[PDB]
Amino acid sequence: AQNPNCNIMIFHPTKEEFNDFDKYIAYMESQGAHRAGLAKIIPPKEWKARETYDNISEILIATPLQQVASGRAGVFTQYHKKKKAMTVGEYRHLANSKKYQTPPHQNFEDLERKYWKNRIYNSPIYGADISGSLFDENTKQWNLGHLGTIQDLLEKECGVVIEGVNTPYLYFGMWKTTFAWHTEDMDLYSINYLHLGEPKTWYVVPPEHGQRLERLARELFPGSSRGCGAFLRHKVALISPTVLKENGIPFNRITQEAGEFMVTFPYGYHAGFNHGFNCAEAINFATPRWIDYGKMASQCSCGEARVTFSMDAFVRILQPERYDLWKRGQ
């Protein structure tokens, strides 16, 4: 059995191995990468996403979000307060201001300690889920806007055409910008590229142990759990590595740097934070191995989670018994 301890694996594909995306995902899984929930892929030296990042300043962040915490340093929720629009250039200047800039620190571990000690006392601002892409159209390898669609995957595996599209999103982060514990919609894969800037630290729970995390979350956020049987779907709960370790929850951590890809695997819970101003791009995707995870994915039907149009078909076809109840929550 490959990677029995569910360690996060790091891959260094050659330029030849970088041609066929699906093939490489399958190769990583043949090595047990998925057991960890998250893998890092370092592109070959011959590859680049686009020529420069010199001309990105005019991109608009239509609704920046201020992430306001409640709770305690290691166990907190965050809610997203909407702010007035601003450009990426304006956001970059804000991230670098004395109020929001990354503090002096010795190494990634010192910064990690400062994050978990101090995050709740600040409210960082970020740009999230901005449809768009920064890959140049001439980048033919691992271009996140040119991947096979989930709708086509389902059609290929199960035989029926469905409506819906699948396009990338941009994220602009600053110090302490936080992504709460979650799996992807319908327990899809994700792929995540860090285009520019400071690092992003990730925490992940092996898929085989996701229920352990759920059980702990239920204990630590008891009101939220009563409100929804899949409340981690809401993407607002944080639990620190110290608290995870105290509670015996299996997990791993890794820092992604600019120029690196991260893949999350079906039912791999993840959370993390940004070290300073950065830009990432991400998209969900599927493979044949996802289908069984999609069939079995929990769903939030309390109303809070969101309205993702593309998800409808996925629930409708894979989860017919649940569909009407889920559709009401939409």
Ligand X SMILES: [NH3+]NC(=O)c1cccc(-c2nn[nH]n2)c1
Question: Binding site: which residues?
Answer: 126, 182, 184, 192, 200, 228, 234-235, 270, 300, 302
Contact predicate 119/178, CB 8 Å:
yes
User: Taking CB under 5 A as the rule, does residue 300 contact Zn ion?
Assistant: yes
Residue given tokens 């109840």 in the structure block: 325
Report the site for Zn ion in 223-242 (rule: CB under 5 A). 228
User: Is 218 exposed, middle or buried (CB count within 10 Å of its CB: 0-12, 13-18, 19+)?
Assistant: middle
Residue 232 binding target from Zn ion, Ni ion, ligand X, none, CB below 5 to 8 Å by type: none
User: Of 40 and 233, which CB lies nearer to Zn ion in the complex structure?
Assistant: 233
Size of the site for ligand X (CB under 6 A): 13
Q: How near is the Cβ of 121 to Cl ion at its closest, in Å? A: 8
Residues making up the annotated binding site for Fe cation are: 182, 184, 270
Q: Which residues pair with 128 in a beta bridge?
A: none
User: Taking CB under 6 A as the rule, does residue 256 contact ligand X?
Assistant: no
Stretch that binds Ni ion, among 39-47, 122-130, 182-190, 306-314 (CB under 5 A): 182-190
Report the site for ligand X in 257-286 (rule: CB under 6 A). 264, 270, 274, 280, 282
Which residue's CB atom is positioned nearest to Na ion?
252
Contact positions vs Cl ion (CB under 5 A): 103, 114, 118
Q: How near is the Cβ of 329 to Na ion at its closest, in Å? A: 36
Which tokens hold the place of 23? 């093939």
Distance between CA atoms of residues 102 and 117, nearest Å: 14
Please, what's the b/e burial string for 160-178 (b: 16 or more CB within 10 A of its CB; e: otherwise)?
Answer: eebeeebebbbbbbbbbbb
Residue 280 binding target from Na ion, ligand X, Ni ion, none, CB below 5 to 8 Å by type: ligand X
Q: How near is the Cβ of 61 to Cl ion at its closest, in Å? A: 23
Distance between CA atoms of residues 254 and 262, nearest Å: 10
Report the site for Na ion in 218-257 (rule: CB under 5 A). 252
Residues making up the annotated binding site for 2-oxoglutarate are: 126, 192, 200, 235
Q: How near is the Cβ of 102 to Cl ion at its closest, in Å? A: 8
- In three-state secondary structure terms, 103 is coil
Site track 131-170 with Ni ion (rule: CB under 5 A), x = hit: ----------------------------------------
User: Taking CB under 6 A as the rule, does residue 190 contact ligand X?
Assistant: yes
Which tokens hold the place of 78? 């965050």
Which DSSP symbol is given to 97? Answer: S
Chain breaks in the chain (C to N over 2.5 A) after: none
Residues making up the annotated binding site for Zn(2+) are: 228, 234, 300, 302
Q: How near is the Cβ of 318 to Zn ion at its closest, in Å? A: 19
Contact predicate 165/151, CB 8 Å:
yes
Which residue's CB atom is positioned nearest to Cl ion?
118
User: Of 279 and 318, which CB lies nearer to ligand X in the complex structure?
Assistant: 279
Strand segments (E) across 206-277: 237-239, 252-256, 261-264, 269-274
User: Of 83 and 114, which CB lies nearer to Cl ion in the complex structure?
Assistant: 114
Query: Long-range contacts made by residues 95-100, C-beta under 8 angstroms, separation at least 24?
Result: 95/173, 95/174, 95/175, 95/276, 95/277, 96/277, 100/124, 100/125, 100/174, 100/175
Name the site residues for Na ion (rule: CB under 5 A).
252
- Which residues of the chain form contacts with ligand X (CB under 6 A)? 171, 173, 177, 179, 184, 190, 192, 200, 264, 270, 274, 280, 282
